[PDB]
Amino acid sequence: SFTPLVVIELAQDVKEETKEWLKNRIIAKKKDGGAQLLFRPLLNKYEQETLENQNLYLVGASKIRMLLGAEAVGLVKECNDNTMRAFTYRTRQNFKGFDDNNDDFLTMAECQFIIKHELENLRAKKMIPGYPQAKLYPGKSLLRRLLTSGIVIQVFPLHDSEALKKLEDTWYTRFALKYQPIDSIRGYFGETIALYFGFLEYFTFALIPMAVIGLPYYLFVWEDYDKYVIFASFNLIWSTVILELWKRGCANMTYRWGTLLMKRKFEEPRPGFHGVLGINSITGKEEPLYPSYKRQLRIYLVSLPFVCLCLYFSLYVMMIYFDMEVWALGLHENSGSEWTSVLLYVPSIIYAIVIEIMNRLYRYAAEFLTSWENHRLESAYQNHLILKVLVFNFLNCFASLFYIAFVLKDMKLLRQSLATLLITSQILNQIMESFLPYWLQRKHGVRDATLYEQVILEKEMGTYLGTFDDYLELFLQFGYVSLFSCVYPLAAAFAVLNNFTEVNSDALKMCRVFKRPFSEPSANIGVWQLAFETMSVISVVTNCALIGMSPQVNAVFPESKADLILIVVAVEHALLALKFILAFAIPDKPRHIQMKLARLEFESLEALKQQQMK
Amino acid sequence: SFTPLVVIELAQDVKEETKEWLKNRIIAKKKDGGAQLLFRPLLNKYEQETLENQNLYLVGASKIRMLLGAEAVGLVKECNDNTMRAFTYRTRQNFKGFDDNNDDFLTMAECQFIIKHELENLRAKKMIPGYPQAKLYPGKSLLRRLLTSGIVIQVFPLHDSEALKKLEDTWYTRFALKYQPIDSIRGYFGETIALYFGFLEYFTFALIPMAVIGLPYYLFVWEDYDKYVIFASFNLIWSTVILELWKRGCANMTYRWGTLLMKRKFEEPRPGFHGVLGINSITGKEEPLYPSYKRQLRIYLVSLPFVCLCLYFSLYVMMIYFDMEVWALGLHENSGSEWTSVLLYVPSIIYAIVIEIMNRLYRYAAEFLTSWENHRLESAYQNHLILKVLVFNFLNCFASLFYIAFVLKDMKLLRQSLATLLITSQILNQIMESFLPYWLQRKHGVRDATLYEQVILEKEMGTYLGTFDDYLELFLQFGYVSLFSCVYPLAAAFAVLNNFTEVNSDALKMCRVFKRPFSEPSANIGVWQLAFETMSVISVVTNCALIGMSPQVNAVFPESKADLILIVVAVEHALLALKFILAFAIPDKPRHIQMKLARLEFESLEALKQQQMK
């Protein structure tokens, strides 16, 4: 009679012995090598209608069990003295907002995170009973072998239809401007989804000065007087400021949530690293082992030539597009003027569609090529995949702008091509990401019952595939903003007016489109902070090269273009030095957050002294 | 009847009440707020001859006390399973090389470090008894108020004349080439002095390829064929390799010694930060407080203009030297050729003496200006002093080479001036640092008795003022090597042949010149790693600017010097990127050291799981 939080769906062809052994490995207590979780079928009785739903199981626990599970996970909650400490059952009266009659203290996400962590840390100590090919060993996780061998079909947490609606009431900003409730988003969806929406809320409120400056700069032709130099330098400094204020805002949020203080959990091998069984050198346990030189050979002799081949084909399609552009320019030169200006925006649109096709095609190819190299952890696997996808997306997005700026050197054609590329890529992004899937979701949607209808609905819901495309879009948004801020700053507003929909659209995507994602703790954006800083470092060189190519600055040095290049290279190195000087001088965390972390450190040092003295 | 390790010399005008209270605060046990150290006068009886030595006291302890003090300090020793763990008395049988009859387990340096740490962590819980002006408060260290108020004259550890000689037998490499015993140096002098000698042993074995290549490059005129491009690029890559291999070698040494695993101790306020007494916000104790904005005002409005004024006077003396150089060149143009070539090396020698005067003059000025800003810790105070001294020493050493290379652009005069500046600075360094003081030390030296003679000798010995000048010399050695490796690579051998004496000379300086230094733990060189990396980053730009100025490469692009500058700036940014790519790709610690640290981390995680399960 408990409250269901997570639904586990087994497969169809699962024998009874594996079912009873798993149920005996689920219901048994934590000291007997079980998990001491409340277990239930989807229906206590069954008829001929629900026989195809006989593998859905409900998992809960009791409050002291969940509190002990919060102790086992290592949740960092606030104490009564406004300090974020780890949760322990012996010191449980010290924490802020804790009563003995409060069922709203640990949220359902943390409980589902704890239940996922208790299902994840449930290892078996030679085969799965009932299945021959399910190769097990002592020290192997049960959930990994049940997921990979096709016994457990899906494990999904449950949406709360009365707390999602009270979130949806404050999420859809259909009336006017409104601060997004990132903390309630956090309390319902974990910290990783909130970090994506927090980075998006930060990136929305960091292109607003760019949009506000660039709004009279585009209608009124004020591109003549400052010539995009003040705003681009301001943008790049603001990007450095925002990449520190994102770090500041992430420190503010993750101190307010506690994930600034959560320790680095030791990472299990990722689902799909297979080798031969042996003794792990680091941990001393038994694990599959793969030689690192074979993996490094499979990377640095197979993956890198494949990435280079895809880069060469992207450059070849880029050169094909420029031959088509010159032919269309000749076709515009041939026929006329009235109907031959709109035809010039078509091949860049066609190239953008081919870019958005090649990006998805490369995404399948990079996923296959990185799941084949047998990476051990998931962070390293994610980093290599992020590296491959970032390289291809940078190249596919900025090759035409680099070819326009540094080979053709034609700012009028650069203004036309940058505006056409940015708006069409943004429109195709908004069409292929959410708008065409929302109509299909509306079409698919048009096509104890409160749980079974929900479980049937969440069986066929979509899974959340991480915040990677949503950061890649922001990376490409940051690419469209900072790379070509010189010829067309108004496009930044066309990004913000996209993100002002995307903030709605992703919210709808979290509300009526997907299943409930599993809660994942994250203290920062990860390598995306480095990627945005690398973008902000590349944009320094790009902004200075756009400074160092105008006819206004070249009018200062009309005859000697060898001192202009030297001064520009000196300014570029000075800008690189000032960016690095700003990055080394500004501390990441503020003073009082550092003082609070120092107090938490000093308390541990005083705890060590008391533990030494006894 | 104990063994004396550290001698404390009180002042003359010290009343008996302060003496008896300190002796009662020394002899009393650790639970009664004392230190439980064996205390002794220098002489149990006194005659009229030794009445002026009545303030010398001997401090020791017993073995279990020293083991408990090693537990209290947190020494990291090797276990029986070849693992470096912290020393505890309950697990004391686990550690490598430990018997119950071994007096050679804890060295005298660690015992003196423990005795210094026990004298340092001995706080009083309103005035010093007998002295009115000695302003005390509960929570204030006794040794700091006894040192600053002139009651304790000096506290010095004792040299071991039979282990220094067995060190001196293996230190003076008077016969031939020999690996310096850095571990025995470590076991006698602590890890900081060994880290200086380890960095010097590394820097000696990293200029040997530079010297070996540059030795036939100078006698046989092979400067024509490669023109210093291969060796300088190799040197800068080697400097990056050596700044990683210093990190590798420091990781190897500090894992072999244990200081890679020692935790960061919380830093007390430095001796000389005075404010008003109040509640410390971080620790919660009672401390003197100073407002940070007043300190930041005293820095950024007084110190930085003073540094700028000293930099302007250094530039003015540099410009004065160049006017003297042009006048002397005209004087060489006037008189003749035979006696007018040696006169050209005199003003650079005079400028070098003025540089070595201005560096010492700036050192007094920077010490005064940084002890006046009331810095709280000693690391921040040392970092600001290191920042000021590095800026002035970089400017005073490389201004003439930058003015020769990028303003006069005369490589023949650059070769002559760089060779003359390097050799004269090295000769004046070897004269003013050790050679003239060794003769004066020989002169001063020519001018239970085994302890009293030693204590009288160590009363008048010199104190070791840290490894700062000895790193500044290496920084200037690295400056003379990597900044002007193009016009004169043979000077690197003249550095190595200096360091081959300096390795002897500093050893003599540690053997027959100074008092025994207090043992100081250090895990790295500190900010000097960043300084050498910043030097290795600056030397990238300098080597490429020396590549981009020769007539050999300019013969490739005779007419278009605007594409040469663009290619050189692209090569410079590529070299900066490759240096940063090499710095981000190469891990600091090796694999097995990381595995051993991971095992020590995994053992703590397993300890946490067992502490959670009970």
Residue A387 CA to residue A531 CA, distance in Å, equals 9
CB B495 within 8 A of CB B200: no
B602:A283 CB<8 A: yes
Q: Which residue has the tokens 């002489």?
A: B43
Chain breaks of chain B after residues with C–N above 2.5 Å: 125, 447
Calculate how close chain B gets to A97, using CA atoms only, in Å.
Answer: 24
Question: Across the strands, what pairs with B505?
Answer: none
In chain B, what are the helix, strand and coil shares in percent, each to the nearest 5? 60, 5, 30
Q: How far is CA B151 from the centre of its chain?
A: 29
Q: How many alpha carbons fall within 13 Å on the CB side of residue A544?
A: 19
Residue A124 CA to residue B415 CA, distance in Å, equals 73
Residue B457 CA to residue B442 CA, distance in Å, equals 14
Residue B281 CA to residue A325 CA, distance in Å, equals 66
Residue A408 CA to residue A545 CA, distance in Å, equals 14
Partner A contacted by B72 (CB < 8 A): yes
Partner A contacted by B331 (CB < 8 A): no
Count other C-beta atoms under 10 Å from residue A610's C-beta: 9
Cα-based torsion angle of the residue sequence A545, A550, A552, A558 in order, rounded to the nearest 10 degrees: 90
Q: Give the dihedral sign, CA B45/B48/B49/B55.
A: positive
Question: Across the strands, what pairs with A278?
Answer: A287
Contacts of B82 (CB under 8 A, 6+ apart): B96
Contacts of B119 (CB under 8 A, 6+ apart): B6, B35, B59, B142, B143, B155
Q: What are phi and psi of A258, to 5 degrees?
A: 110, -10
Calculate how close chain B gets to A293, using CA atoms only, in Å.
Answer: 14
Q: Which residue has the tokens 């001036």?
A: B417
Partner B contacted by A612 (CB < 8 A): yes
Residue A530 CA to residue B324 CA, distance in Å, equals 51
Q: Which residue has the tokens 């703790």?
A: A521
Partner A contacted by B436 (CB < 8 A): no
Partner A contacted by B565 (CB < 8 A): yes
Nearest to A531 by CA among A461, A489, A482: A482
- Which conformational region is residue B158 in: left (phi greater than 0), alpha (psi within -120 to 50 degrees), or beta? beta
Angle of helix B108-120 versus helix B63-73 axis, rounded to 10: 70
A71:B573 CB<8 A: no
DSSP A50: G
CA angle, corner A65, sides to A62 and A69, nearest 5? Answer: 135
Report the relative pairing of strands B38-41 and B56-60 from DSSP bridges.
antiparallel
Nearest to B567 by CA among B548, B552, B581: B548
Nearest to A51 by CA among A38, A42, A62: A42
Nearest to B296 by CA among B373, B366, B368, B379: B373
Calculate how close chain A gets to B79, using CA atoms only, in Å.
Answer: 18
Residue B275 CA to residue B286 CA, distance in Å, equals 12
Q: How many alpha carbons fall within 13 Å on the CB side of residue A84?
A: 22
Q: Which residues of B touch A284 (CB under 8 A)?
A: 599, 602
CB A207 within 8 A of CB A492: yes
Residue B367 CA to residue B327 CA, distance in Å, equals 37
DSSP B435: I
Report the relative pairing of strands A38-41 and A276-279 from DSSP bridges.
unpaired
Interface test with B, best of A602, A603, A611 (most B CBs within 10 A): A602
CB B63 within 8 A of CB B103: yes
B599:A284 CB<8 A: yes
In the 3-class helix/strand/coil scheme, how is B401-421 assigned residue by residue? HHHHHHHHCCHHHHHHHHHHH
Classify residue A577 by burial, with Cβ atoms within 10 Å: 0-12, 13-18, 19+: exposed
Partner B contacted by A266 (CB < 8 A): yes
| Separation in Å, CA A183 to CA A167, A513, B248 | 11, 21, 44
Calculate how close chain B gets to A242, using CA atoms only, in Å.
Answer: 23
Residue A568 CA to residue A545 CA, distance in Å, equals 8
Contacts of B600 (CB under 8 A, 6+ apart): B83, B84, B85, B261
Residue A35 CA to residue A24 CA, distance in Å, equals 10
Residue B278 CA to residue B285 CA, distance in Å, equals 8
Partner A contacted by B319 (CB < 8 A): no
Residue B547 CA to residue A71 CA, distance in Å, equals 62
| Separation in Å, CA A326 to CA A29, A347, A349, A400, B40 | 73, 10, 15, 13, 96
B612:A72 CB<8 A: yes
Calculate how close chain B gets to A185, using CA atoms only, in Å.
Answer: 31
Classify residue B460 by burial, with Cβ atoms within 10 Å: 0-12, 13-18, 19+: exposed
Tokens of A492: 């930044």
Query: Across the interface, which of A284, A541, A562 has its CB nearest the CB of B562?
Result: A562
Partner A contacted by B607 (CB < 8 A): no
CB B247 within 8 A of CB B524: yes
Which residue type occupies B3?
T
Q: Which residues of A touch B71 (CB under 8 A)?
A: 612
Question: Across the strands, what pairs with B135?
Answer: B127
Contacts of A216 (CB under 8 A, 6+ apart): A222
Nearest to A581 by CA among A237, A245, A252, A229: A237
CB A235 within 8 A of CB A481: yes
Q: Which residue of B has its CA nearest to A569?
A: B569
Which residue type occupies B13?
D
Query: Across the interface, which of B72, B569, B599 has its CB nearest the CB of A282?
Result: B599
Calculate how close chain B gets to A21, using CA atoms only, in Å.
Answer: 25
Residue B289 CA to residue B276 CA, distance in Å, equals 5
Q: How far is CA A164 from the centre of its chain?
A: 21
CA angle, corner A277, sides to A275 and A279, nearest 5? Answer: 115
CB A376 within 8 A of CB A270: yes
Count other C-beta atoms under 10 Å from residue A93's C-beta: 9
Q: Which residues of B touch A561 (CB under 8 A)?
A: 562
CB B510 within 8 A of CB B193: yes
Q: Which residues of A touch B565 (CB under 8 A)?
A: 562, 565-566, 569
Count other C-beta atoms under 10 Å from residue B312's C-beta: 10
Residue A88 CA to residue B608 CA, distance in Å, equals 13
A605:B266 CB<8 A: yes
Report the relative pairing of strands B84-86 and B123-124 from DSSP bridges.
unpaired
Partner B contacted by A281 (CB < 8 A): yes
DSSP A269: P
Tokens of A98: 């804790």
Q: Which residues of B touch A603 (CB under 8 A)?
A: none
Contacts of B215 (CB under 8 A, 6+ apart): B490, B493
Calculate how close chain B gets to A134, using CA atoms only, in Å.
Answer: 28
Nearest to B202 by CA among B247, B264, B150: B247
Q: Which residues of A touch B283 (CB under 8 A)?
A: 602
Query: Across the interface, which of A266, A281, A602 has its CB nearest the CB of B595?
Result: A281
B602:A71 CB<8 A: no
CB A483 within 8 A of CB A534: no
DSSP string, A276-341: EEEE-TTT-SEEEE--HHHHHHHIIIIIHHHHHHHHHHHHHHHHHHHHHHHHHHHHHHHS-SSSSS
CA angle, corner B187, sides to B184 and B192, nearest 5? Answer: 105
Q: Which residue of B has its CA nearest to A561?
A: B562
In chain A, what are the helix, strand and coil shares in percent, each to the nearest 5? 60, 5, 30
Question: Across the strands, what pairs with B127?
Answer: B135
DSSP A222: T
Q: Which residues of B touch A612 (CB under 8 A)?
A: 71-72
Which residue type occupies A593?
I
Q: Which residues of B touch A562 (CB under 8 A)?
A: 561-562, 565
Calculate how close chain B gets to A535, using CA atoms only, in Å.
Answer: 14
DSSP string, B84-153: EEE--STTGGGBTT--SS-TTSS-HHHHHHHHHHHHHT-EE--B-TT-SS-B--TTEEHHHHHHHTTSEE
Residue B181 CA to residue B186 CA, distance in Å, equals 8
DSSP A270: P
Contacts of B12 (CB under 8 A, 6+ apart): B55
Angle of helix A182-204 versus helix A491-511 axis, rounded to 10: 160
Cα-based torsion angle of the residue sequence B16, B18, B19, B22 in order, rounded to the nearest 10 degrees: 160
Question: Across the strands, what pairs with A79?
Answer: A95
| Separation in Å, CA A541 to CA A214, A536, A544, B396, B567 | 21, 9, 5, 32, 15
Partner A contacted by B610 (CB < 8 A): no
Query: Across the interface, which of A266, A562, A598 has its CB nearest the CB of B605?
Result: A266
Query: Across the interface, which of B282, B541, B566 has its CB nearest the CB of A598?
Result: B282
Nearest to B378 by CA among B193, B527, B198, B250: B527
CA angle, corner B89, sides to B258 and B101, nearest 5? Answer: 90
Residue A465 CA to residue B267 CA, distance in Å, equals 46
Residue A211 CA to residue A234 CA, distance in Å, equals 12
CB B480 within 8 A of CB B425: yes
Q: How far is CA A283 from the centre of its chain?
A: 30
Question: Across the strands, what pairs with B106?
Answer: none
Q: How far is CA B65 from the centre of its chain?
A: 32
> For residue B10, what is the enclosing H or E element?
strand B6-10
Interface test with B, best of A89, A263, A282, A591 (most B CBs within 10 A): A282
Residue A136 CA to residue A140 CA, distance in Å, equals 6
